[PDB]
Design a protein around this ligand. Sequence first.
Ligand SMILES: NC(=O)c1ccc[n+]([C@@H]2O[C@H](COP(=O)([O-])OP(=O)(O)OC[C@H]3O[C@@H](n4cnc5c(N)ncnc54)[C@H](O)[C@@H]3O)[C@@H](O)[C@H]2O)c1
Ligand SMILES: NC(=O)c1ccc[n+]([C@@H]2O[C@H](COP(=O)([O-])OP(=O)(O)OC[C@H]3O[C@@H](n4cnc5c(N)ncnc54)[C@H](O)[C@@H]3O)[C@@H](O)[C@H]2O)c1
Ligand SMILES: NC(=O)c1ccc[n+]([C@@H]2O[C@H](COP(=O)([O-])OP(=O)(O)OC[C@H]3O[C@@H](n4cnc5c(N)ncnc54)[C@H](O)[C@@H]3O)[C@@H](O)[C@H]2O)c1
Ligand SMILES: NC(=O)c1ccc[n+]([C@@H]2O[C@H](COP(=O)([O-])OP(=O)(O)OC[C@H]3O[C@@H](n4cnc5c(N)ncnc54)[C@H](O)[C@@H]3O)[C@@H](O)[C@H]2O)c1
Lengths: 75, 68, 338, 338, 338, 338
Amino acid sequence: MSNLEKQIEQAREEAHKICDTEGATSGQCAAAWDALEELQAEAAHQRAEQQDHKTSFQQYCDDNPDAAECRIYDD
Amino acid sequence: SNLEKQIEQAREEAHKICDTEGATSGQCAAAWDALEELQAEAAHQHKTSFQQYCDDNPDAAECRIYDD
Amino acid sequence: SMVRVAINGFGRIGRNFMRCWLQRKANSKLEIVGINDTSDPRTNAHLLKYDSMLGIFQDAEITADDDCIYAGGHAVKCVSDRNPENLPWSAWGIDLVIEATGVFTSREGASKHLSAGAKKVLITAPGKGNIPTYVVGVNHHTYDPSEDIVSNASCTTNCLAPIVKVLHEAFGIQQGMMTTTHSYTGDQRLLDASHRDLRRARAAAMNIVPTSTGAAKAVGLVIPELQGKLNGIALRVPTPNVSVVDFVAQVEKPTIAEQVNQVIKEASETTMKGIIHYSELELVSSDYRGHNASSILDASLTMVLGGNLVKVVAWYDNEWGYSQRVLDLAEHMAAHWA
Amino acid sequence: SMVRVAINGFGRIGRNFMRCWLQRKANSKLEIVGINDTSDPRTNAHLLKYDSMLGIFQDAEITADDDCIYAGGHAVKCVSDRNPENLPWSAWGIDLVIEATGVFTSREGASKHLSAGAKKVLITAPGKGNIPTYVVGVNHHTYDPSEDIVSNASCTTNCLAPIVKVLHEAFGIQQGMMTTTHSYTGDQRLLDASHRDLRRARAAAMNIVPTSTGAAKAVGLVIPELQGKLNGIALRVPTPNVSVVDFVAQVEKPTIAEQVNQVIKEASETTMKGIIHYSELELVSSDYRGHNASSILDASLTMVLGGNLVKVVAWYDNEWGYSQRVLDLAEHMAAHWA
Amino acid sequence: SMVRVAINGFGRIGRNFMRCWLQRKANSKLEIVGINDTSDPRTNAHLLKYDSMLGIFQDAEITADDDCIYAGGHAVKCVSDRNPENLPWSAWGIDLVIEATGVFTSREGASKHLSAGAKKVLITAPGKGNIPTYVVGVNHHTYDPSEDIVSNASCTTNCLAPIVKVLHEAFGIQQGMMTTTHSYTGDQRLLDASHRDLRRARAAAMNIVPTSTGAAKAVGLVIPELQGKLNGIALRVPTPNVSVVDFVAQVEKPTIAEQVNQVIKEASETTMKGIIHYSELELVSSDYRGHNASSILDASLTMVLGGNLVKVVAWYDNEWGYSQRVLDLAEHMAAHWA
Amino acid sequence: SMVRVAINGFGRIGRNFMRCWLQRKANSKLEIVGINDTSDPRTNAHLLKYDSMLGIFQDAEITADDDCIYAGGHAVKCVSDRNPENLPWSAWGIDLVIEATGVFTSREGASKHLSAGAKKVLITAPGKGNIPTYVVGVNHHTYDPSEDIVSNASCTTNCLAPIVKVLHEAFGIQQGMMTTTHSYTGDQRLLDASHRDLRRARAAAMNIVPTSTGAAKAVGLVIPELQGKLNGIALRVPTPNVSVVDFVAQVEKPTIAEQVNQVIKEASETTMKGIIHYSELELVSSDYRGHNASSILDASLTMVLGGNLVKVVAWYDNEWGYSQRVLDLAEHMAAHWA
Ligand SMILES: NC(=O)c1ccc[n+]([C@@H]2O[C@H](COP(=O)([O-])OP(=O)(O)OC[C@H]3O[C@@H](n4cnc5c(N)ncnc54)[C@H](O)[C@@H]3O)[C@@H](O)[C@H]2O)c1
Ligand SMILES: NC(=O)c1ccc[n+]([C@@H]2O[C@H](COP(=O)([O-])OP(=O)(O)OC[C@H]3O[C@@H](n4cnc5c(N)ncnc54)[C@H](O)[C@@H]3O)[C@@H](O)[C@H]2O)c1
Ligand SMILES: NC(=O)c1ccc[n+]([C@@H]2O[C@H](COP(=O)([O-])OP(=O)(O)OC[C@H]3O[C@@H](n4cnc5c(N)ncnc54)[C@H](O)[C@@H]3O)[C@@H](O)[C@H]2O)c1
Ligand SMILES: NC(=O)c1ccc[n+]([C@@H]2O[C@H](COP(=O)([O-])OP(=O)(O)OC[C@H]3O[C@@H](n4cnc5c(N)ncnc54)[C@H](O)[C@@H]3O)[C@@H](O)[C@H]2O)c1
């Protein structure tokens, strides 16, 4: 998460810059808040999956159920 | 010999009629009844070429039976 | 009038379903008006027309533009959004979503279509969690118009459950074991490659591949008395479509093979017509492409040991027969739409 | 001295058997000195060296001329007569004939080798009629030197009988049903073509093909207490080698899957060592190419219902593992020749 | 006033021909009245109906007894004699024999049908020796009604020769090389087994198998100006039907791919209509199953280097398209019956 | 000294490459210390050991825990990051990355390993843009040690370019067309499914699938004399590994087939030893599994028309032979590290 936390910091800084310039209730502000919130949510997803001793591969499969590596068709 | 000539014909007629008119049709019933009436004489009185071929050539592709 | 249907996931089942409807469109209360899928309309139209398994669609012309697929003039609007929440089911007026992505099989996942504005969702797969599951011919008459999320179960469940219902009502099934020798499906890798399931990781067209399956246990959802009394496994083999289920049951009333076959033959001419088909011919898998039944009993293979140990074998076209049943369930929901 | 062996029929089993012997040539009581086959020595030497399933033979150089195949200087004289009565078995001092044509499986047929001068015949297939049948690890120590025509059963019987013996001694088998999902074999046509068996008539690499089989009934020959209590079928699928047997049995002593697996595991370490291999790995058919065990229990797939209904699943290399048992049985006969 | 026809060899081509004629029967000068084959009629009728490649025959019922197969109430007399001199052609009133066994392609062998009472023989293969060879659309109007044994050439020659004729007349072919990437045929082995061709001996569904072919030299027989100027090879691959020819030629009049394609498209709409189909679609082999053309030019693949080195690629259904040509040639012979 | 190597993308090429190095470990200046891939170490150890195409790895024991794969007790650290910018190349001391994901073949993508800490990147594919491209045995001695990103071209270019080089030096290639009949690969679909390329969308084990290819044009990158003089296409066919190039060239010096073969044979014995193998044996694709050479000329198929139109046919194991050349190039880079 050390890399992801750097993405949260850059995404927080840009969110505050956009929201204070383009307006607290604007489209760019709502979108930039989205980027920060989505990252924060996956920082908590990845954190709760690490305490499950879940590999990064299994975190990938939870985020990408449609991927060729993750499809389980119960024939 | 001459009566199985008839039976052969009656069988062809039953196949042609039942395939064009349907197994449940009266025509198909009449055709088969004509056949059974003629085979009743066979009571008053074999290996196919393919079978004999597999007897002679059990290694041929047409004849192999491997018990898997 | 008619129910507005959208397909989510235009894959093998999605496209088989679409072709099933086009063949039965004359007598139908469903209108397919929308598709969501990972691909663009032109790719979707090409794959709908040119099918390695079904052959070239010839009933109607198929074309496409930036926005729609057209099948014989009648238009189908297309969109590409992975997240069902954003789907324009509102704007499109979607009543029923055919959920065939393979990924939104839980109530949480499937209900996202309802947030986007559809009334009901039909999952072409077993539900995760307590979603009502139906098998047409077995329990589809217990469908309540008040259910907004439904499962049509798996293809193997659709083959096995009608046969089990016949044998259970005729002889009394005490326990039951299943093996489906199954065509490979799109969840297996083409060559040895990363997969969460080490068996599905392996080259599908090179290998016999066992997989665990819930399909036999799920018969107990549509036949409640047999809950916990059935189990089985799957063997994926290198054929691209058509499968066969092998079922061995311990039964209560002693019987013989001739009597088992007669019981299934009579049921297929009466209570299970169109669902079970009875065959005494010595056919192979290719001959069952496009068969509309959920199950084709191969009567030649039936055997009984000791009066009470029964083996039956049944074919099913896992893409096309199942999709016919999806359409059957959708028409039933439409005929009883509340 | 050495027991001198001729192979009649240099096909998949005849050539697998030959390569099995070449690899165990150092410790062996057998000396392969002759081959009879419908083809010439140069063709058969090419096929012996270049095998689509086993790869290129690496151990010894393989050469041929008009009369002999040479496998590392070791010379194997060759002849090509479809009538075994005409074979030079007396002149070549043949003790043991490996009957691998698939054609002379009755006493009358196999005895033509005895008329030609051989002392004993080992049929690589079930016998027709009353021919003593052996599965190594099950009943091969019952072999009597005075039996001059014997059968090594089929590949499916060799996989199933060891498991059946273990399960019967531990739990008491009352009845049992089998399905083998089997690689296609050379008795099936490549494309739809003439055949006396309407299912073997069909294109083998495009189809799941059911066939009847005596392989489960044959287990009652090597385990006589189970005679009449076993039956089953075969399903040929588009793989060229390696098969898998699915066995469902009613047992007398109540049990669970963990106990069934533990019993077969213990046997694999003791009374069935080298015959049964117990695996808890999630493998697929290609991984069992060249495996020497007659049966590889896929422990992950074991299931039990209600204590008494038991399903086990076992892999086998129907070409190579079986030929290893043919080699084993012939070595046993050499050690008990009189 | 219809020509009475017997089929010798009811194999892939024999039965594809039969099903071609059954569909075109309403407009035909031919009545198929007889079949000779290794198989009995009940085997032959089963395989005529149930075809892994063509699917189940739908247009009419097909049954058999000991003596005939019946297709929609039309009886076809059957016999099983492997020596054509013994065949009842005089008794059955046979005019034309379709020689599709693959073993009577010499004049001497084909002529055995004449002494049994047939009037003419059409060999569904290249002839061995001095047999007039025809490709419909290339040279079939040079047919002489006084010829009693003719060859329809091979499937590859029927695909290549129409394109070669169009290219030659447009640009002047000086030399040309060919490779047909070709579905496997019944002449190959399912698993490694003896064969006069050491490559065709090898497992056909597991290998790319190079074989030689006279099919490019055979183009010189039907375009005499190009005799000696064409050669090539085959690569047999693991598909059961549909093939593709790749032709690289040195031409005399410099051009570009767009003009090569235009020339062939114009001919496919005029002088080669029904023979050559011009395709700009991005399809695969499955999509050309059942196509009636001898050659389907895949126009996206055409390329030209330095003006004079031209590559073209054409599909053909080697069973069905070729059988359509056999029937065309037979109808032509029937229209010029002297 | 030893060059520390990490593999990015543990797929077909990455795992073949790993097994190539493990067998050459005693005579190598490379040390494989790291792997990045989608899956975890346990999954990747399983797939490295159990390979449907290569069989079970025999040489060294393979195990894994949560952090590492162990091969012969040698530990290989594993990570799973889709973004190469984040990989621990500096911490792990990586000198060379094998770029085998198929996703980072442009300078923008591959340079992410450089900013992550690696010193050089070797792309196991054509490099996009101005990335220097090498074929070992053709131009790898033009490698400049100051290059930070290099490409090993494609498998087909590695087959074609050595033969092109030998033919060009002896006879003078003016122009040439290529068709590769090629095993399917992971970029195709198991069953008809969405794909940017509408032909690779189609079920790979069912179809012959034409695709355009850069491989013949790319020969001009490593033989600049011939830039713009070569073109060609691919046909993907239902085999999982091993391919064959069919090359038709216009040459300046007239020649005959025996002389073409002698020239290639002579090069295979001298300057091209281990790159080109010359075969007069009648083999099929399965026989070339695991062959170390980039190109195996099939001499029986060589033909020449009119003296100046030459056809040669060459086999290649597209997974293993290619990975041997990746290893070869990495070894060359390590021998000239700067
Ligand atoms: N194929 C069968 O035999 C069969 C039979 C019965 C049931 N099923 C079930 O039906 C479901 C689909 O199976 P299939 O064989 O059609 O698989 P498939 O992979 O061919 O089809 C899945 C389709 O959905 C698309 N998709 C994936 N994620 C998506 C998303 N987030 N949004 C929109 N589209 C998305 C894919 O691109 C693909 O087009 C599976 O649950 C399967 O178990 C399959
Ligand atoms: N393939 C398997 O998995 C397998 C396993 C166990 C047992 N078997 C049994 O072993 C026997 C051989 O099967 P296979 O797969 O090796 O078949 P195959 O067709 O590959 O081999 C048979 C060989 O015998 C030759 N042959 C046929 N008739 C002959 C004659 N009259 N004289 C001399 N040679 C003759 C054939 O040319 C061929 O070389 C069969 O009975 C089969 O049921 C096969
Ligand atoms: N399959 C193709 O793509 C194709 C295309 C064009 C031409 N051909 C040619 O057609 C001919 C038949 O090929 P096919 O693919 O139909 O092969 P096939 O093996 O499917 O058919 C041959 C039929 O003839 C029978 N037969 C063999 N010997 C016989 C005899 N002595 N008497 C009577 N019947 C006998 C066989 O049992 C079989 O039914 C060959 O000459 C072949 O080269 C084949
Ligand atoms: N297979 C061949 O015959 C062959 C021959 C020569 C070159 N190539 C080339 O080699 C490359 C790999 O081909 P392949 O057949 O091994 O494909 P593959 O799909 O088998 O291998 C790709 C591997 O990389 C992993 N991967 C994907 N994205 C990743 C990411 N962002 N980070 C880390 N790992 C990732 C995958 O999960 C997979 O394990 C391709 O460029 C291909 O063009 C292939």
